[PDB]
PDB file of C-alpha atoms and ligand atoms in Angstrom:
ATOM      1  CA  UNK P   2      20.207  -5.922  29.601  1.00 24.73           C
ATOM      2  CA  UNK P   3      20.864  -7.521  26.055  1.00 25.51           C
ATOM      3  CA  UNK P   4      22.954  -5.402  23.996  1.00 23.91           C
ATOM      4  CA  UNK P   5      20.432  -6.299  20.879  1.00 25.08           C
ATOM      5  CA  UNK P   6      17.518  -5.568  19.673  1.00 22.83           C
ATOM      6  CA  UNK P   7      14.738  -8.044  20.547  1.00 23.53           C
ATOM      7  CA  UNK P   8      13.143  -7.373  17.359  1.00 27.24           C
ATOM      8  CA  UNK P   9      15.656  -6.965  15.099  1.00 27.69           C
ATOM      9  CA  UNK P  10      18.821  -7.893  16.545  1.00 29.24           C
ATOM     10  CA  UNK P  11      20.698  -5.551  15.735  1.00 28.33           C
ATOM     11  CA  UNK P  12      22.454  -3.162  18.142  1.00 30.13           C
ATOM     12  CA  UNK P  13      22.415   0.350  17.695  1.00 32.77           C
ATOM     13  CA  UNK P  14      20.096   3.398  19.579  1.00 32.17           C
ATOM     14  CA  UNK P  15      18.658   1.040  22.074  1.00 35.26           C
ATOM     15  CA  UNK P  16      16.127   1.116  25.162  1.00 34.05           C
ATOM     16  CA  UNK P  17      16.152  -0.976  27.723  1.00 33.76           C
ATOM     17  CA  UNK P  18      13.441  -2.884  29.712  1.00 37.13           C
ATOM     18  CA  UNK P  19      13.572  -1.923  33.577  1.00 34.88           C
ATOM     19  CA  UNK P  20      11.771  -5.164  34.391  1.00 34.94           C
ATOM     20  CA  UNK P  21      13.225  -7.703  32.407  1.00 36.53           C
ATOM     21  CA  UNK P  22      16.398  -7.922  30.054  1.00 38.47           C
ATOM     22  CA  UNK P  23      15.292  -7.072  26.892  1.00 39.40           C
ATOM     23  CA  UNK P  24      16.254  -4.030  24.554  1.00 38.74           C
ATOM     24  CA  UNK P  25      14.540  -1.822  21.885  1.00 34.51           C
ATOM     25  CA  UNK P  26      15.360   0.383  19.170  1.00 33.76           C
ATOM     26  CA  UNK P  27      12.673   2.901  19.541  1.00 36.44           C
ATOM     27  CA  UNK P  28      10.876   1.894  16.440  1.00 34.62           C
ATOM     28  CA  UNK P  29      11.075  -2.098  16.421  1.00 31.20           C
ATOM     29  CA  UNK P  30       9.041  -1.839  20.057  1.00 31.26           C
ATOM     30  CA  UNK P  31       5.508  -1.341  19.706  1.00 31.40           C
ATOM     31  CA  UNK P  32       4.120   0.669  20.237  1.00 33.82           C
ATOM     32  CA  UNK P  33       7.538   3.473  19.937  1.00 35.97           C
ATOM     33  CA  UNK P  34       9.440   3.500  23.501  1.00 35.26           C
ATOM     34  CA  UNK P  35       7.734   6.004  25.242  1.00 37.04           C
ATOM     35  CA  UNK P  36       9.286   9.159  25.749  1.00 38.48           C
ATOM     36  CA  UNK P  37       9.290   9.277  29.586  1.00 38.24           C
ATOM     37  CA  UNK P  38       8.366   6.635  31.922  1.00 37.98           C
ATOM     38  CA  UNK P  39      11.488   5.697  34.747  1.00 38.66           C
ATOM     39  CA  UNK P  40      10.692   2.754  35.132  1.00 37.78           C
ATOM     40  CA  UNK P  41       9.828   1.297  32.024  1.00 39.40           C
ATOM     41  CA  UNK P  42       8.179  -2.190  31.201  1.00 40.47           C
ATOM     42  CA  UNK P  43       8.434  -3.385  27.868  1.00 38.27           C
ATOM     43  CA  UNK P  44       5.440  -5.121  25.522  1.00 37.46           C
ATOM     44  CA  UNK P  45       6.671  -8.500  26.888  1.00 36.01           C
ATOM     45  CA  UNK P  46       6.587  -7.404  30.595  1.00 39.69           C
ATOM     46  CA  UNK P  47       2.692  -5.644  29.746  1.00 41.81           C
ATOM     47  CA  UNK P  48       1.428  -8.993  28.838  1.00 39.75           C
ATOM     48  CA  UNK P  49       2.986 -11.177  31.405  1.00 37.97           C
ATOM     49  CA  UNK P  50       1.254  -8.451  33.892  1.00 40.21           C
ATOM     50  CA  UNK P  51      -2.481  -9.162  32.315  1.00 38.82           C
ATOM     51  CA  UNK P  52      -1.674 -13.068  32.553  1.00 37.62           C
ATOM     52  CA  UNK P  53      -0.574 -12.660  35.912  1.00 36.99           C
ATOM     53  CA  UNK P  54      -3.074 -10.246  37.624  1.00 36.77           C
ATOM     54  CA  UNK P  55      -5.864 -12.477  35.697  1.00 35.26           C
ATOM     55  CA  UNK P  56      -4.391 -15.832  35.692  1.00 35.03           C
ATOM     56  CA  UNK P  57      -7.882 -17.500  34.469  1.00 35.55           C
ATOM     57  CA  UNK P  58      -7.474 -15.146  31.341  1.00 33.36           C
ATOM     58  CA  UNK P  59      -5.383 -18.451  29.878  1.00 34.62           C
ATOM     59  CA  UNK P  60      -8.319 -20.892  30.100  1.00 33.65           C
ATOM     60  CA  UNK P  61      -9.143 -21.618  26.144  1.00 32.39           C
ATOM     61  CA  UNK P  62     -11.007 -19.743  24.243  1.00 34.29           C
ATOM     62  CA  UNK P  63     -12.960 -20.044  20.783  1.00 34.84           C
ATOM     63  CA  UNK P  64     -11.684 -17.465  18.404  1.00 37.29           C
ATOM     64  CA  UNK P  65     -14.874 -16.547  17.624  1.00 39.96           C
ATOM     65  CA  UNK P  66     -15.583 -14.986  20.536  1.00 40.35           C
ATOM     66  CA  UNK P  67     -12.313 -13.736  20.432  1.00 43.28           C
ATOM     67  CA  UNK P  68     -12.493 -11.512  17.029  1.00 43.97           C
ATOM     68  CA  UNK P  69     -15.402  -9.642  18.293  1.00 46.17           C
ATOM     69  CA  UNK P  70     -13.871  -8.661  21.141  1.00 44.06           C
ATOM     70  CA  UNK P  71     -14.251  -4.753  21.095  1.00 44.11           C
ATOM     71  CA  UNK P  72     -10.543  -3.479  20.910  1.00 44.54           C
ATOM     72  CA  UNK P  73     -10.113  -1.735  24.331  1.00 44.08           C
ATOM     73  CA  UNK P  74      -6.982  -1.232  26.003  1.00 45.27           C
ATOM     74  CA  UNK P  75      -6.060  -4.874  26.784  1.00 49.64           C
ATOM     75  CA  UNK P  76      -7.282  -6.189  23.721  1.00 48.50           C
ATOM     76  CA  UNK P  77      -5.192  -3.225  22.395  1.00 52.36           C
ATOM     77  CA  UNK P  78      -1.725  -4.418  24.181  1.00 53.01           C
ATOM     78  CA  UNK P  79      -1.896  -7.934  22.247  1.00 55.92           C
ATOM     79  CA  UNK P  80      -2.922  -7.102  19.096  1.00 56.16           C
ATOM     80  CA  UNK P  81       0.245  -4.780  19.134  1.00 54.29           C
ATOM     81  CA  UNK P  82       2.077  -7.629  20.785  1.00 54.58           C
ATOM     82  CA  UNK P  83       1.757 -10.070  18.371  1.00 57.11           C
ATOM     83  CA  UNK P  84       2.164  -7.403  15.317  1.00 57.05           C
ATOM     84  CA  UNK P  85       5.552  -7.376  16.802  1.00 57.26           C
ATOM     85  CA  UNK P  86       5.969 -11.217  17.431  1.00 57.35           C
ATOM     86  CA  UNK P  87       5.929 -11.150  13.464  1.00 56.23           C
ATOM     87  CA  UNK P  88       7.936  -8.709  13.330  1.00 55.60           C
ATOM     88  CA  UNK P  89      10.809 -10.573  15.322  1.00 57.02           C
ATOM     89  CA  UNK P  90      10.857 -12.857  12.247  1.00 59.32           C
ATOM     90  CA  UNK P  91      13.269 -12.338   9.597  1.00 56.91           C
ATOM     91  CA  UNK P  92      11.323 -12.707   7.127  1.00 56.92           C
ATOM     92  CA  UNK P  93       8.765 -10.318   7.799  1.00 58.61           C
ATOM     93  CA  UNK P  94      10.802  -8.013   5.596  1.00 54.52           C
ATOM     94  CA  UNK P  95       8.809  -9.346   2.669  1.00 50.55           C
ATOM     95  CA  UNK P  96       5.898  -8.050   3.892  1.00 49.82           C
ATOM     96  CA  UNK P  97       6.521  -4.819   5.879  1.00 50.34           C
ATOM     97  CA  UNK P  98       6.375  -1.947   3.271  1.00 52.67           C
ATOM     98  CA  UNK P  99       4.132  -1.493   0.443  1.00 50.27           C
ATOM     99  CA  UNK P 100       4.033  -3.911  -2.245  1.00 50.71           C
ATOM    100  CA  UNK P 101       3.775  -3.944  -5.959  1.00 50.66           C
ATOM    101  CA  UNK P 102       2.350  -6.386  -8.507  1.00 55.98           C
ATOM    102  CA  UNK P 103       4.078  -7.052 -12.162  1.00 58.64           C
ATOM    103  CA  UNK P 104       4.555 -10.454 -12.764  1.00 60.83           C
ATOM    104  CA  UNK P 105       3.299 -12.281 -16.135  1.00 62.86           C
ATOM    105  CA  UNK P 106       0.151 -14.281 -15.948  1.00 64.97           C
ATOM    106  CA  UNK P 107      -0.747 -12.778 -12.186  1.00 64.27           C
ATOM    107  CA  UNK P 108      -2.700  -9.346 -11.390  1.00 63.87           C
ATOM    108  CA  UNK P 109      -2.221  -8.039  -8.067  1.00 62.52           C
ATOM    109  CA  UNK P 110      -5.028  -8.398  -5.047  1.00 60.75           C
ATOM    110  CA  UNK P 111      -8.162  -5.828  -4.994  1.00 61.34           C
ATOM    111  CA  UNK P 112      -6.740  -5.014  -1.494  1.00 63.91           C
ATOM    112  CA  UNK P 113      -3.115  -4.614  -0.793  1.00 66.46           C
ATOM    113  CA  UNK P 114      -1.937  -4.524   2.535  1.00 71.14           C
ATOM    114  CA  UNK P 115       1.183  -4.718   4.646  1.00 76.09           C
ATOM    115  CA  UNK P 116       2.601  -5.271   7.835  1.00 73.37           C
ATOM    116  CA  UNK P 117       3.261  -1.375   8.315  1.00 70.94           C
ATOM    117  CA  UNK P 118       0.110   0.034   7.186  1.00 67.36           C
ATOM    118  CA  UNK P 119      -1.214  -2.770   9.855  1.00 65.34           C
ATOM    119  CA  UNK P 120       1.351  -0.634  12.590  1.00 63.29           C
ATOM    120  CA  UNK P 121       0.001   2.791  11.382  1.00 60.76           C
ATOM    121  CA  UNK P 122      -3.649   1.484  11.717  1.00 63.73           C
ATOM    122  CA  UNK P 123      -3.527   0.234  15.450  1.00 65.61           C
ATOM    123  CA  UNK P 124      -1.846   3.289  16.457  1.00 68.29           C
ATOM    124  CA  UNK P 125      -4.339   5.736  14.859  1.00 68.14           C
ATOM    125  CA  UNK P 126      -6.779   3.173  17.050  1.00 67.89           C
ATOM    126  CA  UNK P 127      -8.743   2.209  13.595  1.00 66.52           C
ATOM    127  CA  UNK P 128      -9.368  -0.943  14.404  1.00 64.98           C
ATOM    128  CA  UNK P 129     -12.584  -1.487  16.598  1.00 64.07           C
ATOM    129  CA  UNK P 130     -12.698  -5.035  17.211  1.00 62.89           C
ATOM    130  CA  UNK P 131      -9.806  -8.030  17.057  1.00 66.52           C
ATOM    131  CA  UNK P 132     -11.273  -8.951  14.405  1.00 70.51           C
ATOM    132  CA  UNK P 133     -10.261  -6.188  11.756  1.00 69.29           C
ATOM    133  CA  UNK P 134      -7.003  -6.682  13.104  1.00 71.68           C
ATOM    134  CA  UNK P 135      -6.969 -10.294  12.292  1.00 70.73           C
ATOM    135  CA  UNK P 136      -8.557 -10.081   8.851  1.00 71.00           C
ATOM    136  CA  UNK P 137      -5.726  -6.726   8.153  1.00 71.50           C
ATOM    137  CA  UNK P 138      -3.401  -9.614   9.301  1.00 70.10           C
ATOM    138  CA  UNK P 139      -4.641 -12.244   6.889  1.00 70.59           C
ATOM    139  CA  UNK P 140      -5.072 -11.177   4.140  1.00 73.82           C
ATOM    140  CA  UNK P 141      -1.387 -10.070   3.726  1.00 74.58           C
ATOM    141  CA  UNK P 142      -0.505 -13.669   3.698  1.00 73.67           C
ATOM    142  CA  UNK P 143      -3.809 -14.633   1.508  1.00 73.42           C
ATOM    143  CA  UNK P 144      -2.749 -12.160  -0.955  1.00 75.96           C
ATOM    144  CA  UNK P 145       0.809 -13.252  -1.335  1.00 76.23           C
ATOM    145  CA  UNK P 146      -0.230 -16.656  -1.779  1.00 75.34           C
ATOM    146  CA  UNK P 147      -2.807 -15.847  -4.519  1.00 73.44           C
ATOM    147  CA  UNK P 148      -0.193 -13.720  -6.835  1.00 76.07           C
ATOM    148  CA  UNK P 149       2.852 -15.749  -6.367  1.00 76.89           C
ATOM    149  CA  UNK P 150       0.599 -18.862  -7.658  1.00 75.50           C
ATOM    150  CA  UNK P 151       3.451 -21.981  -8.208  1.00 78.42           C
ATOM    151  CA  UNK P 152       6.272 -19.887  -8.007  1.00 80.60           C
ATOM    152  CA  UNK P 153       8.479 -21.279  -4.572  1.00 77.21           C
ATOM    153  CA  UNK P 154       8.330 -17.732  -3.455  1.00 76.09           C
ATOM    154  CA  UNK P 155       4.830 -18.786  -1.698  1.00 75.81           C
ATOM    155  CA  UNK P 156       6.093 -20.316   0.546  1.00 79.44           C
ATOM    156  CA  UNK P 157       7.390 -17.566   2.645  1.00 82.93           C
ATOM    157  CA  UNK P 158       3.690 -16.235   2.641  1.00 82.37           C
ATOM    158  CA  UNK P 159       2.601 -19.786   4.325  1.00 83.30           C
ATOM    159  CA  UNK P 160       5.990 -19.436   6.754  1.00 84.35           C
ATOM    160  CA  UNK P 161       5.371 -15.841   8.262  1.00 83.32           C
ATOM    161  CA  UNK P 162       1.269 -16.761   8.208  1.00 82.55           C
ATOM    162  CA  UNK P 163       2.336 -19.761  10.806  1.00 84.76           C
ATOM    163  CA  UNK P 164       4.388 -17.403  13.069  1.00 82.90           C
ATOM    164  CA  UNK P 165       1.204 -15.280  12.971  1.00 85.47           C
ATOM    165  CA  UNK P 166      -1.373 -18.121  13.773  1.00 85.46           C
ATOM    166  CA  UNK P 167       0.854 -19.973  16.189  1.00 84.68           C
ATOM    167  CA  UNK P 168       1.676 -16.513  18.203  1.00 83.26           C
ATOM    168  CA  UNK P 169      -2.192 -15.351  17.826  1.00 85.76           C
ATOM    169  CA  UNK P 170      -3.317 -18.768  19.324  1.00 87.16           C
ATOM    170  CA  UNK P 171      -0.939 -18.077  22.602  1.00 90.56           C
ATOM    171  CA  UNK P 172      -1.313 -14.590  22.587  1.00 89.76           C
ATOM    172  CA  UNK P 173      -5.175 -14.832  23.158  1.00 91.85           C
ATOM    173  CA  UNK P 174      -5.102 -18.337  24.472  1.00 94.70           C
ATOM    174  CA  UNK P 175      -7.089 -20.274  22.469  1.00 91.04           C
ATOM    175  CA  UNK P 176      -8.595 -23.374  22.948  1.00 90.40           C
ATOM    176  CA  UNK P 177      -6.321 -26.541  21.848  1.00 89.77           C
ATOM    177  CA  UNK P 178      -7.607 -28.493  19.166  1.00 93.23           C
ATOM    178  CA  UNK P 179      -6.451 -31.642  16.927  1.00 90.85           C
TER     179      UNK P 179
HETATM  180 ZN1  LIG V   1      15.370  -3.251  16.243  1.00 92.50          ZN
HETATM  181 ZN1  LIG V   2      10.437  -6.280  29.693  1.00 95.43          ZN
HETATM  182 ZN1  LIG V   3      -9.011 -12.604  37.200  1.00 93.94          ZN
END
C-alpha cells in the first residue's frame, strides 16, 4: 500500500485499502474508516464496484435528471465520493472550515457554507436528493466569488469550483457536451 494519504498526502495514522493500494487517515476518507470490516474496500474501490456490476450506469446522462435523484445508498456513495475528490485538492483548505466576512466595500453572503458543514450534512443523511448536495456544493464557490469581487483571490473560488464540476460530471457520468 502507499505510505500516504490519498487525500492529504501526508503520512501519519493511516488505513489501508485491502483491494487496491491506497491509504487513509481515518478522517480524510469519507465517510471515517470504519471501525471493523477485514477486508476493507475503500471509497475508490465502492465506486469502481457500482460501475462494474452496472456497466450501462456510464451511458450519459442529463444532470437534470440527475439532481433529483432521491439520495439512496448509491446516490449516497458518490456524493461522498466526490466531496472527497475536492478534498484531494490542495486548495480546498480555503474552503473547509467556517468562514468570515470583513473586507471594505464587500458584505458577506446571506448563506455561508463550507466544505465541512457539507461533510457533517451527508453524514447526518440531510440531504434528500443530489440536488441539495449540489446546490450545498455551489454555492461555496458562488459565494467566494461574489465577496472577493476583483481581488485575484477569486480565482481560487473558480479553481476548486472546476475540480468540483469536472469530478461531478465523471462521477455521475454525464452526458458530453461542446
Ligand atoms: Zn489525510
Ligand atoms: Zn481501494
Ligand atoms: Zn446493470
Amino acid at each position: 500500500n502507499s505510505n500516504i494519504c490519498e487525500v492529504c498526502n501526508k503520512w501519519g495514522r493511516l488505513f489501508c485499502c485491502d483491494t487496491c493500494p491506497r491509504s487513509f487517515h481515518e478522517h480524510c476518507h469519507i465517510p471515517s474508516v470504519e471501525a471493523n470490516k477485514n477486508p476493507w474496500s475503500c471509497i475508490f474501490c465502492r465506486i469502481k464496484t457500482i460501475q462494474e456490476r452496472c456497466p450501462e450506469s456510464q451511458s450519459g446522462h442529463q444532470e437534470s435528471e440527475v439532481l433529483m435523484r432521491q439520495m439512496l445508498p448509491e446516490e449516497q456513495l458518490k456524493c461522498e465520493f466526490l466531496l472527497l475528490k475536492v478534498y484531494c485538492d490542495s486548495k480546498s483548505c480555503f474552503f473547509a472550515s467556517e468562514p468570515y466576512y470583513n473586507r471594505e466595500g464587500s458584505q458577506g453572503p446571506q448563506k455561508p457554507m463550507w466544505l465541512n458543514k457539507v461533510k457533517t450534512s451527508l453524514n447526518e443523511q440531510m440531504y434528500t436528493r443530489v440536488e441539495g448536495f449540489v446546490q450545498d456544493m455551489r454555492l461555496i464557490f458562488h459565494n467566494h466569488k461574489e465577496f472577493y469581487r476583483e481581488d485575484k483571490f477569486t480565482r481560487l473560488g473558480i479553481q476548486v469550483q472546476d475540480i468540483f464540476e469536472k469530478n461531478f460530471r465523471n462521477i455521475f457520468a454525464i452526458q458530453e457536451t461542446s
